[PDB]
Structure 1
């Protein structure tokens, strides 16, 4: 796939708002993922023990990790499609060490979209949401192709 420049603009315009509070958005997203799809929490050995949303909210380590995650994703989106390098180390650790199935990357994509829609309605109307969804599909498709080359296509 290939996004046009007007779509990349809609994606980097709402991402610039996200970057005003990275740790807050990272928290929201990872908690929305764990609540919505609880089986994904089992992949995290560090967080597994969290029982409620209050606990998740209070976890400092969780919040730090949400910053790591959104920082990486942000660096991939700003590439506007030329992310091959950035995608390599990411696909190798999620496919080999963590063992994350594409299916779960779709689940987190849905959590990202849910949270921008709640926090930025004015900058996330239907066209901008279509553009973000297109940018994450692109990401998942390239990751899935990397998975296959690495031997996991999980």
Structure 2
């Protein structure tokens, strides 16, 4: 839960690359999530009728939601762990409305790592991977704690 300064800078350095193309990274990540863990697709009534990869690729709406998701994540990462304010609304909606278990957040964490490797063969190596994994694990543990604070089991 306590990352080094150097680890946070690895996280934010690669995130700067994500921010050069938020929608593309976002679409890539959701497509990867749905492919690797198809049960997650059922959480999205708006996407569950995209039945092939050609269909997912062509979904402009999916790109837009990629932006929605990554924009929230980016703001969280930039807080370097001091993300209580950002987690409040997100835990509320994800615990009580969307009903996303923490395990699904582990699934999307894996998709994020995968896409960062795919998109950044030059500057997302072992150290950057380790750092990003720590940052995403912190997010998951803290949001799990917030679910519980709200009275919910993630």
Q: Where has structure 1 moved over 2 Å in runs of 4 or more?
A: none
CA displacement at 1:31 relative to structure 2: 0.1
CA displacement at 1:60 relative to structure 2: 1.2
CA displacement at 1:121 relative to structure 2: 2.1
CA contact (8 A) 1:91 1:143 kept: yes
Q: What is the CA–CA distance in structure 1 between the aligned matches of 2:9 and 2:114, rounded to whole Å?
A: 20
CA contact (8 A) 1:33 1:108 kept: yes
Q: Which moved more, 1:117-126 or 1:24-33?
A: 117-126
**Alignment gaps of 5+ in structure 2:** none
Q: In the TM superposition, what whole-angstrom CA distance separates every residue of 1:94-145 from its partner, at most 9, and x where no partner exists?
A: 0000000011000000000000011112211111100000000000000000
RMSD of the TM alignment (CA)?
0.7
**Alignment gaps of 5+ in structure 1:** none
Q: What is the CA–CA distance in structure 1 between the aligned matches of 2:35 and 2:24, rounded to whole Å?
A: 16
CA displacement at 1:72 relative to structure 2: 0.5
Q: 1:34-73, aligned counterparts within 5 Å?
A: 34-73=34-73
TM-score (norm 2): 0.98
TM-score (norm 1): 0.98
Q: Which moved more, 1:144-153 or 1:106-115?
A: 144-153
Q: In the TM superposition, what whole-angstrom CA distance separates every residue of 1:44-76 from its partner, at most 9, and x where no partner exists?
A: 111111101111111111110000100110000
CA contact (8 A) 1:13 1:123 kept: no
CA displacement at 1:24 relative to structure 2: 0.5
SS in 2 for 1:122: coil
